[PDB]
């Protein structure tokens, strides 16, 4: 397939491994979730504009909606980390180990 899909799928894998390897810091991985949604947006929109399949051009917009509609959820799940604990460090999320 085309040259640009190499780098867009590569950007998906880079944001994947950025999400999938934590650095004791939760906002920086919520950013990687948002980046994975960005890469999925760009890849699907490149394919839909390539095909001239116009009716699923509303598909990435809807996609984009649920992007923030989960990512804001992460932010609302971030403050509950940061009101209980001092920071959002994921090593404070180990109380369910016993």
């Amino acid at each position: 397939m085309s040259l640009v899909y190499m780098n867009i799928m590569m950007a998906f894998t880079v944001s994947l491994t950025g999400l999938l390897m934590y650095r004791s810091h939760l906002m920086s991985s919520l950013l990687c979730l948002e980046g994975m949604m960005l890469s999925l947006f760009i890849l699907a929109t490149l394919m839909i504009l390539n095909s001239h399949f116009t009716l699923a051009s509303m598909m990435p917009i809807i996609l984009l909606v649920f992007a923030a509609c989960e990512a804001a959820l992460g932010l609302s799940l971030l403050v509950m980390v940061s009101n209980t604990y001092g920071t959002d460090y994921v090593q404070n999320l180990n109380l369910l180990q016993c």
Binding site: N50, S51, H52, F53, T54, L55, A56, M59
Partner: protein, 52 residues
Amino acid sequence: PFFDVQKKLGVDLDHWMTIQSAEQPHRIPARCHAFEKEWIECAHGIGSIRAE
């Protein structure tokens, strides 16, 4: 469990975005309209195992 409610009730929720050959706004064809239409009309009702 594909509870096929849309064929049971006859309502049309998402049979329209499903393929490129469907009813498009202002009758816009895709670049692969004829190829997809020929493969869909080839493989209709003959099952996956025979269709592939």
